[PDB]
A paper describes a structure:
Spermidine/spermine N-acetyltransferases (SSATs) are catabolic enzymes that acetylate polyamines and are critical for maintaining intracellular polyamine homeostasis. SpeG is an SSAT protein found in a variety of bacteria, including the human pathogen Vibrio cholerae. This protein adopts a dodecameric structure and contains an allosteric site, making it unique compared to other SSATs. The allosteric site is located between monomers that form the hexamers of the dodecamer, and some evidence has been provided that shows when polyamine binds to these sites, the dodecamer tightens.
Our analysis of the spm-bound structure of VcSpeG showed these two regions form potentially significant contacts: π-π interactions between F32 and F149 and an H-bond between R25 and N152. To elucidate whether these residues could be important for stabilizing the interaction between these two regions of VcSpeG, we created three point mutants: N152L, F149A, and F149G (R3C4-R3C6). We substituted leucine for asparagine at position 152 to retain the overall structural similarity of the residue but remove the ability to H-bond, and we substituted alanine and glycine for phenylalanine at position 149 to potentially decrease the ability of this residue to form hydrophobic interactions. During our kinetic analyses we found the VcSpeG N152L (R3C4), F149A (R3C5), and F149G (R3C6) mutant enzymes still retained reasonably high activity toward spm. The catalytic efficiency of the N152L mutant increased slightly (1.2-fold), and the F149A and F149G mutants decreased 1.4- and 5.3-fold, respectively compared to WT. Our analysis of the spm-bound homology models for the R3C4-R3C6 constructs showed all three retained spm in the allosteric site. Based on these models, a substitution of leucine for asparagine at position 152 (R3C4) caused the H-bond between side chains of R25 and N152 to be disrupted, while the π-π interactions between F32 and F149 side chains were retained. The single point mutants we tested in Region 3 (F149, N152; R3C4-R3C6) were insufficient to totally inhibit enzyme activity. In cases where only a single residue in this region was altered (R3C4-R3C6), the disruption to the activity was far less.
Numbering used by the authors:
A (entry chain A), C (entry chain C), D (entry chain C), E (entry chain A), G (entry chain A), H (entry chain A), ...: 2 to 170
B (entry chain B), F (entry chain B), I (entry chain B), K (entry chain B): 2 to 173
Amino acid sequence: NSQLTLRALERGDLRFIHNLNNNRNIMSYWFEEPYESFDELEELYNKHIHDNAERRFVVEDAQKNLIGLVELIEINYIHRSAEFQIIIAPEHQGKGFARTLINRALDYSFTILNLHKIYLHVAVENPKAVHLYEECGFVEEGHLVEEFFILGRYQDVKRMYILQSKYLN
Amino acid sequence: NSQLTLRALERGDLRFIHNLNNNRNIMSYWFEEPYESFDELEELYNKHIHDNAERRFVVEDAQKNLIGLVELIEINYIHRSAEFQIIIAPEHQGKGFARTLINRALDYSFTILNLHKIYLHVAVENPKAVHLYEECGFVEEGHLVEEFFILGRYQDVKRMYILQSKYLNRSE
Amino acid sequence: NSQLTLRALERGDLRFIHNLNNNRNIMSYWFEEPYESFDELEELYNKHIHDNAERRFVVEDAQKNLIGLVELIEINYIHRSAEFQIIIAPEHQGKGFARTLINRALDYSFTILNLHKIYLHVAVENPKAVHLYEECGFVEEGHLVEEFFILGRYQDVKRMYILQSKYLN
Amino acid sequence: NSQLTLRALERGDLRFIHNLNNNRNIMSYWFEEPYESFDELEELYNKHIHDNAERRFVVEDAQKNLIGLVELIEINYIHRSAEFQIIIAPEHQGKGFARTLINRALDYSFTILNLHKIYLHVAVENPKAVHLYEECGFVEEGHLVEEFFILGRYQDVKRMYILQSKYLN
Amino acid sequence: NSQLTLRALERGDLRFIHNLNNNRNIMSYWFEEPYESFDELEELYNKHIHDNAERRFVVEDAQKNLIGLVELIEINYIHRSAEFQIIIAPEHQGKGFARTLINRALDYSFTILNLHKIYLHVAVENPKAVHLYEECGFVEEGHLVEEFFILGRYQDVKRMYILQSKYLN
Amino acid sequence: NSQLTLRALERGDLRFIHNLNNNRNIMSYWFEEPYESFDELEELYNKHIHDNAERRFVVEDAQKNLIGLVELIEINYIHRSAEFQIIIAPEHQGKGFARTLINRALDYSFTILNLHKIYLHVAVENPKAVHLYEECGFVEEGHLVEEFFILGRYQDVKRMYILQSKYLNRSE
Amino acid sequence: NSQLTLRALERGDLRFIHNLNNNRNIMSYWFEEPYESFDELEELYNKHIHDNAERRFVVEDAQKNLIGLVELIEINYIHRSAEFQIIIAPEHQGKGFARTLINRALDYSFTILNLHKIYLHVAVENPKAVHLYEECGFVEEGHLVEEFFILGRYQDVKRMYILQSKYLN
Amino acid sequence: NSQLTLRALERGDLRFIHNLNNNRNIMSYWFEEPYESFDELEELYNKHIHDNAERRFVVEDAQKNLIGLVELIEINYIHRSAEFQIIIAPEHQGKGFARTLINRALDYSFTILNLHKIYLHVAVENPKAVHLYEECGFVEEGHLVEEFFILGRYQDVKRMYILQSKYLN
Amino acid sequence: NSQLTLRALERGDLRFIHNLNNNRNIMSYWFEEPYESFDELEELYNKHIHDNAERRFVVEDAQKNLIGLVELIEINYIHRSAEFQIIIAPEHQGKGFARTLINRALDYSFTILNLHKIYLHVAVENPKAVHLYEECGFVEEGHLVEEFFILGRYQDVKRMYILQSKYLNRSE
Amino acid sequence: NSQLTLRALERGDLRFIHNLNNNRNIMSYWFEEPYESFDELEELYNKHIHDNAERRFVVEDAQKNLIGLVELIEINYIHRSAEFQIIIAPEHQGKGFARTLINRALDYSFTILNLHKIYLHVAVENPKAVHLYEECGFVEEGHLVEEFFILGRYQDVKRMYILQSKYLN
Amino acid sequence: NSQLTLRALERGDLRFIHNLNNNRNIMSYWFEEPYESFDELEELYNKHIHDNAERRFVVEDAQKNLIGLVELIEINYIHRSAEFQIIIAPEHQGKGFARTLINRALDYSFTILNLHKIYLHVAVENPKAVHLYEECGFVEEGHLVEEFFILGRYQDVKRMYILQSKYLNRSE
Amino acid sequence: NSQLTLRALERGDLRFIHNLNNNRNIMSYWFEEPYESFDELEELYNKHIHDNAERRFVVEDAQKNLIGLVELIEINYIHRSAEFQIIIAPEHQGKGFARTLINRALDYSFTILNLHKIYLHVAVENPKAVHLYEECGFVEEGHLVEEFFILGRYQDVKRMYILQSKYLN
């Protein structure tokens, strides 16, 4: 866990991004633009390579195995808020890397970007993920009703948040 | 109030939008792009004239007086949702036009755009607005903590929503 | 009727088009691109000025009052088919001009463009329009179920057609 | 069947597409634009990479042999409708994979894209295809007369449809 | 007749061109591109303003009344040939201006452009026009069968020609 | 001859077209643009790759040997007509492939493009070609006087045509 | 003083900006690009109209007389700092508007932009301006030696600052 | 000599063009634009690859050895005239290829381009070249005085011509 | 004639050029590009506004009446030569302005442009023009055979020239 | 003299510039590009609006009559040198304003731009100008032989200079 | 240390710059544009390849090993000043190369760019760096309060400077 | 010496140019634009490929070892003047090739380009270079005072010239 590194996303990592999506079974977006193919993703990456509304980091281990992805989107530098997401490769989901990657993401958000609030969305139907984020310091601030359409159904999601003051202390 | 008519926004209405946003005292955005002056607004309008992620409508009375603005942003056509805002000009705020514009907005969103969910954000320190939207069918789904920096401090905002099934089948 | 003239649409007619589509109850499209405002219509008109997938004509009287619009869309020149739509201004709807405009459209489609088939969609809940088109030479070829979302509910539409051979003989 | 996988179309698949459309007997189109040569297809693919009016998926087996193509065109997101087409390679046509591909298409349309209605056109002179689509859940809603010019004569086609409610329940 | 002048076409004359077309009832082209609206024509004129494959001249009288149009198209400067057309305004068609405009057109073709052959197409169903051009020196070289589609029918046309050697002598 | 297959032209076939046009000894054109060298051809191909006013097809045998070219130009979709040309490579001219390519061209023009009339031009001083096209159904509709300047003198050309109704209903 | 309003800069105000510069006798910059002419300024304004690294506000009175200019430049939204400048028209420099405009500028900086630090540069040879800014809450943090070249000499400037915490309390 | 072939110039031949110039010691032009470097030539060739005012042919032998260059410039298709030039590689200048290449150039000019007049410029100080062209059918039509600046001096040149009528007979 | 002044051509003078070229009855060119109408001319002017291969000047009297045109084309700065043409408006042709404009043209070419040779072409069937240019210092250097096709036949043209050394040192 | 003001050149001043350069006897240049017509000057002004290699100022009197132009060209900011030129209108040449304009130019060059050396070229055949510049602080540093072709013959020019140290002390 | 050579930065050196900036733990900028990944850097390099507001040089030993980076930004040619930074690769930090690179940077700034003032910023919590630059001639001119947010808190930075007259005439 | 050849500069020579300018002690320029890196030089070369204001030639020996560079800049074709500069590689500086390269430059300038005057700048502190250029035909025409900032101090340079008449006779 202590040997996990965060590295800014490169064009060579887009293949890794693509494979992570085929498992999800939900529409994927790149700077709020939809995509399904690897070629769409690459075109969009070229387009938004300098846009600073979203930042992405590839999580690797010592042996450079691709462990997961840390995502910040909807970054607003006046209100100093950003939406946060984690995606661990299926083969690494049980090993307990999640809490380390969450802390790495919060560290970058609150120590370098100088953000004030980090929030996220967790499906209410996945209560173990909600508990995980609650142990990591997040608190529920909303229960969005039928917010997203996932596998043929409208689903609720917990919107949870953590402030910079609480993480730094 | 039935004299009121909702009309798609034109470039000629941008001055009206600019005068409305000067009194907000919170940073204004046009397709998630900040703007303060009229020239920045007009250029942003020209850039996003065909972008369907946001739709705006100005309401006029029979005499074509500019009453207010109806704003739909973050329009997502996979999840079929959007964020709604209403801005009545100061000189028309106390005339009871609010509930009429809200229902016009919901009717367009749920009948012509065939959207599924309409949500909005209301300052927690504005209880009369929260009650207004509750009277119109909106229900609180979140209490966002220190979401926006307003007048020198981070403030809370209620996120309230209404669904298409409710708006169209509640009286059946 | 005999003094109703067909004229290719010009930029100056776009205001007339915008007023006709103001009260329709369904999203208006220009070359399969949606629009609501006059400005959006004008830039779409500039973008598709030379696109021959659709052709539009304003009908005027002898004194050049604008009565309505004839629309040909989805024009395919391999199969020689096109979808037709007529819209008459509210002030001129009851004066009994529809049949003349319909046949003016058919004449242009079958005598100038050399098309083979003209079809149209009419709401099932507008039986008088269905009867009208039947009386002008159209025959039902389909009952599309829940094709369009109109006034808050999905509605059926009749697809009706007429061929070049039948009209020109 | 269970090992048949749906994958978003890539540029490398354009050769497979060109071979499928070589023996079809009708002009092939890419986003309503005609084409015959591979080079023309490739530049049309580049031009419409981000156009969401159509979505295409190649179906492969476990060993990644290309079996066929699923096509969604004329996608409207206000009315939530789309036209569907399946094309199986000649070598894999008799192996009885069609039903699996059809339902894979319906699953993506009704569980990810959140569409309401899927319709298709099938030649009247292909009764086995009509029966197949009927057996998979489609119902005839139209008998389009002389819709397409195929093999030197105009031919009728059945328009058949299925709704999201029926498939997901 | 001797007071008729030929003047190279200007943008201000496109309105005159447009009105001449509404009487014809046949598809109009501008450098082999179709058009119906005045706005299409103006866009096309701007596009091809320097293309030398076609040349056009407005025929005016002493009082500057717009009498007609002289057209040269498909100009080939290796084989030195060009297709020629005359269009007289309906109000001037009986006064006998035609022969003068034909000679003016041939004069420009054979004395300035140094062309070798000028040909034209006359509907066989208009035998008086065929006789006119025969008196002016043209000879029939072809009877094109069902060449053009005019008012719902395929029509034949006489292709007639005149050489530079014969006109200069 | 049934082994022969007609295939849409690709950029890789441009060298074949260039070698075919070197023996013509009459100015070559690509969408009515003159060209002499291969580089000019390749650039013109890139410019008109989507222009539907002309369509070209190369014919190959079972071994993928380049036999000839099928050319349709001046394609008009209002009048539904086009000009047709055939060019067999010198090393395959005497094998009797001509009539097979002509019928393949007519079949594509009249069944998939749904054209109404196909016409062509033949040098009057090439009587065997005129007879060939007559055998395939073409009829003379014009004798164009001094149409083209060829090898130092203006020459006549026969314009010959065939209609869709004939090609598809003659044996019924 | 209480009737002074701040208004975001418009293209129509560039003339006012230009006149303010002719009095200064120092090189003027627009988004770190030099300019002397009004035409240079207008071209630069068009170029950087959306750049958010600098913001400008015109100070007007009740009668809409142009009083001065408030300038924020070098805005960094990670470190949340910005350089601040005031320029009062010569005819209004003695009336005591300065302190009001300084507070208006700090108010916008600390209540809307959510900035953390605002600094400025004052010529050491203008000690009365240094005292003014010190009374308004600024403190000296640097004495830059020969930083700028003004009227033939290299001059020192006091760099003074104020934090958001101190202004809000 | 009978085994010499003319071939339209290709980009791969520009190197051969370049080497031919280094021997000349006079300023070289490409479509009336000057050049000295091979990179300038290549850029100019890309620019004017479709311009038909100049045509160039590489003369090769049976073994594909580069023998020379045939040049036509200032081609005017109304007056049907063009300037003609020959450049033989130094290693092939004595073998007597010149007369064959001159006839090949005239043949293309008068049998394919259908030109009327071909002229050229020969330095009066090279009387043997003047006699050669006179034997090949050219006649002097001018003695241009100090027309060109060559190796530090203004030099005269004979302008000689030949007409199409004389070459074809 | 000393009242006459030579001025660089402006876009406002293009109508004057167009009226001058209508009476030529020989194809007009603008930087070697053919043009017949005013719109083609104006577009060509915009394209070549900075091209220094040609320079043009309009001559005006004290009342600013448009008298004629001075044209220098084919300007080569390595060989330092150019082709010269003069075109006097019909209503001013018999006033003896020709020799004044010619010397103004030569003076600009040889003093400010520092050119070495000025040549021109004159129709052989226009002997009075040939004599005019001879009187001004031009000498015949060529009799071009069937150079231009004019009014239905190929005609001859005299090529005449004058050098800088002569124009500037002849009276010394 | 004291009422002579220096103003950065605007587009509206280009007519004044054109009139000054009408009678100069030498080709005029704009950023080393030649020009004669007003239109050519205006487009060159648009092209080099932001090019800082040259800076120009019009001098006006109190009533804003245009007296002349100050020109700085060939400005190098590494070596801090620039070539200077003054042009006074013919109507204002004898009023004795030159010295004031010269020093206004030197003040801007040495007090605002922070240049080190200003040099100029003056014709040897204009001794009064040479004496004038000498009297204002310039010293001859070169006698360029046959530098410029003026009035049909090459002429010498004096290059004269002055340094920042001497002027500011 | 005299073996060290200063060389203008090339595109091939961008990987070296990227590896240097990963250890900074403070947001990196390229012509005042933020960047984190190598691809963003390479694109920014292509955009500003000719922008003279910043100049960068990589130092190499005799074996061409990449030692460090010399950075000049905010270059102003009216005031003749610039901000200087030095970044030695971790594996070469303790070899005493710092003072050599600093003097190479000052020599280029004051002899070839003819600048007047060079200033730099040093974290107040890095006293050994402050002493290093003092040893090289830099003098403190400011103590910037809470200038930069570093590792979760606002920190102070010393602004230090040196003038051209001093660097070039101190030993005279 | 006789085997030293002049060749127009190519893109492949840009590395040789970069190495020559590495040790010069003065900012290098390409068409008056400064540069330091090879990449900056290469893009400047692409931008000015056709700009004739400057012309450069690499000198090679018989075995094609690169000895130096001849540079012509500030070329004016009205006045027919140009500034000349020679740079010899350090390895070939003492072999006594300078005079040959100088005259090769003069030959091209006076026999091909038809220029009138060639001038150059040489540091006053390089008397051997001054003597060399004097011995090759140059004459001092100026002693520019503090023209360039070299090695931390402003230095004088001699401007020396030679005319076409003197060289060619």
